[PDB]
């Protein structure tokens, strides 16, 4: 596999269908993602809803879905309100929330 051999799907979100009628036992939905070649539709399970909710996924965001773990990860291309302001001198808002320092990239 590329990087890893886990079944992963990622792409920019074209469309989002999330149930609002299903009981809090097993939510469902239908996601439309733009891949490298085309937009494909993927079925959302309860854990998928969970993951996309956690990542705060909306149309226009990009995310990856782990078929094995059921975890969803927003990649970073198609985002929303990313801080482009790094000239933080009078900006005492150093709210760099530790969301998982995966690999010591480090600024």
From Swiss-Prot:
GO terms for molecular function: 3'-5' DNA helicase activity; 5'-3' DNA helicase activity; ATP binding; ATP hydrolysis activity; DNA helicase activity. Signal peptide: none annotated. The keyword Calcium does not apply. The keyword rRNA-binding does not apply. GO terms for cellular component: chromatin; Ino80 complex; NuA4 histone acetyltransferase complex; nucleus; R2TP complex; Swr1 complex; TTT Hsp90 cochaperone complex. It is found in: Nucleus, Nucleoplasm. Keywords: Activator, ATP-binding, Chromatin regulator, DNA damage, DNA repair, Helicase, Hydrolase, Nucleotide-binding, Nucleus, rRNA processing, Transcription, Transcription regulation. GO terms for biological process: box C/D snoRNP assembly; chromatin remodeling; DNA repair; protein stabilization; regulation of DNA-templated transcription; regulation of transcription by RNA polymerase II; rRNA processing. DNA helicase which participates in several chromatin remodeling complexes, including the SWR1 and the INO80 complexes. The SWR1 complex mediates the ATP-dependent exchange of histone H2A for the H2A variant HZT1 leading to transcriptional regulation of selected genes by chromatin remodeling. The INO80 complex remodels chromatin by shifting nucleosomes. Its ability to induce transcription of some phosphate-responsive genes is modulated by inositol polyphosphates. The INO80 complex is involved in DNA repair by associating to 'Ser-129' phosphorylated H2A histones as a response to DNA damage. Present with 3030 molecules/cell in log phase SD medium. Belongs to the RuvB family. Probably forms a homohexamer. Interacts with RVB1 and may form heterododecamers with RVB1. Component of the SWR1 chromatin remodeling complex composed of at least ACT1, ARP4, RVB1, RVB2, ARP6, YAF9, VPS71, VPS72, SWC3, SWC4, SWC5, SWC7 and SWR1, and perhaps BDF1. Component of the chromatin-remodeling INO80 complex, at least composed of ARP4, ARP5, ARP8, RVB1, RVB2, TAF14, NHP10, IES1, IES3, IES4, IES6, ACT1, IES2, IES5 and INO80. Also belongs to the R2TP complex composed of at least RVB1, RVB2, TAH1 and PIH1. Interacts with SPT15/TBP. This is RuvB-like protein 2. It comes from Saccharomyces cerevisiae (strain ATCC 204508 / S288c). The lineage of its organism: Eukaryota, Fungi, Dikarya, Ascomycota, Saccharomycotina. The gene is RVB2. The chain holds residues 132 to 234 of 471 of the full protein.
